[PDB]
């Protein structure tokens, strides 16, 4: 069986392979007229390139402020990753944390921070233990924390993390924030996605569920540098967006006898909505408590 340090080597090659195939499918140069519909600079048009230009590139034309504060793009009423190539001409709008109703942005940020935790979970434990990622529960943001279900080896059936172990998870999360890695989104056919995660049993089941929902049966793929995972919905562009990051506690889901599923919870806040030390300690306590999706 493939080793853990060489299992990611092929997942990147398969990911890059498919990332380069889509680019070749596009003609040498094809233009798309993207119209801006917002309170600011209304009527501006971006004559961009098909399958290459992203919403971020459209903001670079306007100003650096749009780039720094535009967390997510709204394309034809549908949210759009800021680093996702544009396939056709369409209206575009930019979303920020500070809006009248930034519901979609909050969901994206909450999903990204969970995916970030999955990356540090695959490196903390030794190479002798089999850490198998399951999924990222789509819990609301008012719940007080984001979670990511995980399974551990039979040896670690009763081992419970301590305060010092929970702190090391964060130092790996902030170390991931210091690299300033961009979230890369790739929409692939379900059949192609199964090949990448053919080794992990849990991921295959999750992919099958997504294929049934969409008639096209395409699955979105996101990767942070080398780490690759399957997630639902758009994500934020970069890791540097999150200023405060901490994993609060770990809860064991029931029933434990048939299988053990641990729930790594956490909470975070971006740079745009930085909180105070005193208020940040209040949010952590709520996060330590176990949360259950509706």
């Amino acid at each position: 069986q493939l080793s853990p340090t060489e299992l990611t080597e092929m997942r990147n090659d398969l990911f890059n392979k498919e990332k380069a195939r889509q680019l070749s499918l596009t003609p040498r140069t094809e233009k798309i007229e993207v119209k801006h519909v917002g309170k600011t600079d209304p009527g501006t048009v971006f004559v961009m390139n098909k399958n290459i230009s992203t919403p971020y590139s459209c903001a670079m034309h306007l100003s650096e402020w749009y780039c720094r504060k535009s967390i997510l793009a709204l394309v034809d009423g549908q949210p759009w990753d800021m680093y996702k190539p544009l396939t056709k001409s369409c209206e575009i709008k930019f979303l920020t944390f500070k809006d009248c109703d930034p519901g979609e942005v909050n969901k994206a940020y909450w999903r990204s921070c969970a995916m970030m935790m999955g990356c540090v979970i695959e490196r903390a434990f030794k190479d002798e233990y089999m850490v198998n990622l399951v999924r990222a529960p789509e819990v609301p943001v008012i719940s007080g924390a984001f979670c990511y279900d995980v399974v551990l080896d039979s040896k670690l059936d009763e081992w419970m993390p301590t305060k010092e172990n929970l702190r090391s998870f964060t130092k790996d999360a902030h170390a991931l924030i210091y690299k300033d890695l961009p979230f890369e989104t790739l929409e692939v056919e379900a059949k192609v996605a199964l090949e990448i995660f053919q080794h992990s049993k849990y991921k295959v089941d999750f992919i099958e569920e997504k294929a049934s929902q969409n008639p096209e049966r395409i699955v979105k793929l996101h990767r942070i540098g080398d780490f690759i995972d399957v997630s639902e919905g758009p994500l934020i562009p970069r890791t540097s967006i999150c200023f405060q990051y901490e994993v609060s506690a770990v809860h064991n889901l029931q029933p434990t006898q048939p299988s053990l599923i641990r729930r790594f919870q956490g909470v975070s806040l971006p740079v745009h909505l930085r909180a105070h030390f005193t208020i940040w300690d209040k949010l952590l306590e709520r996060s330590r408590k176990m949360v259950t999706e509706d």
Partner: protein, 242 residues
């Protein structure tokens, strides 16, 4: 000594001639008309005498038009006896090719002999600080003299010629970065080149005048970079309208 105090650039606002004379009256600046026998001499005409529209799909009433051109040939042969129509289309290729090779080496001293004064700015103005690499790979279809017409003190004759040949174009910006085109792959071109010659002038010659752009032409190659077309820059008081 050696002292001259200069002020900053003024940048006159009104460009039109009317506004200048409309503003010179408000300022009391009276400019009496000129008086001189010498006038300028133009070697080329400003525009075409009879607009040509190529037939769609080229990429009684029809027969008469071909005869009108034949009549104009006579005029061109009254000032030049040794002139044939079965050689000019072969001669135009030499001018066309030789006029586009002067853009690579910036040979403007010889480019005036090939093109007119009306055409020379259009070609050189945009590429003043740019590098061009144009070549003639092959010729697809022979050229044909589609239309010949003359003017009604001087007399000029225009000879429209149709060209269908492959070309290679790569335009590089001031810094050497690729700006437009591909130097490896040629492409088909269908452009009608117009020539002019001042018959009256004993030292005249046939030179490129302009390029006919048909309304039914395919779109040109797209550029490499992206563009942003801003909208109205409204004032605070004024509101935006759909």
């Amino acid at each position: 000594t050696k002292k001259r105090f200069t002020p900053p650039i003024y940048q006159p606002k009104f460009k039109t001639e009317k506004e200048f004379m409309q503003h010179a009256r408000k300022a009391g600046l009276v400019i009496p008309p000129e008086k001189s026998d010498r006038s300028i001499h133009l070697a080329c005409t400003a525009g075409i005498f009879d607009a040509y529209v190529p037939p769609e799909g080229d990429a009684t009433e029809r027969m008469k038009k071909t005869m009108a051109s034949q009549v104009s040939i006579r005029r061109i042969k009254d000032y030049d006896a040794n002139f044939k129509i079965k050689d000019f289309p072969e001669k135009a290729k030499d001018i066309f090719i030789e006029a586009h090779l002067c853009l690579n080496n910036s040979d403007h001293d010889r480019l005036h002999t090939l093109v007119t004064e009306h055409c020379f700015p259009d070609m050189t103005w945009d590429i003043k600080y740019k590098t061009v690499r144009w070549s003639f790979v092959e010729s697809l279809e022979p050229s044909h003299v589609v239309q010949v017409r003359c003017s009604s003190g001087n007399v000029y004759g225009q000879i429209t010629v149709r060209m269908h040949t492959r070309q290679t174009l790569a335009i590089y910006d001031r810094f050497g970065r690729l700006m437009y085109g591909q130097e490896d792959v040629p492409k088909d071109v269908l452009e009608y080149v117009v020539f002019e010659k001042q018959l009256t002038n004993p030292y005249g010659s046939w030179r490129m005048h302009t390029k006919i752009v048909p309304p039914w032409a395919p779109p040109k190659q797209p550029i490499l970079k992206t563009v942003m077309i801003p909208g109205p820059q409204l004032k605070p008081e004024e509101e935006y309208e759909e």
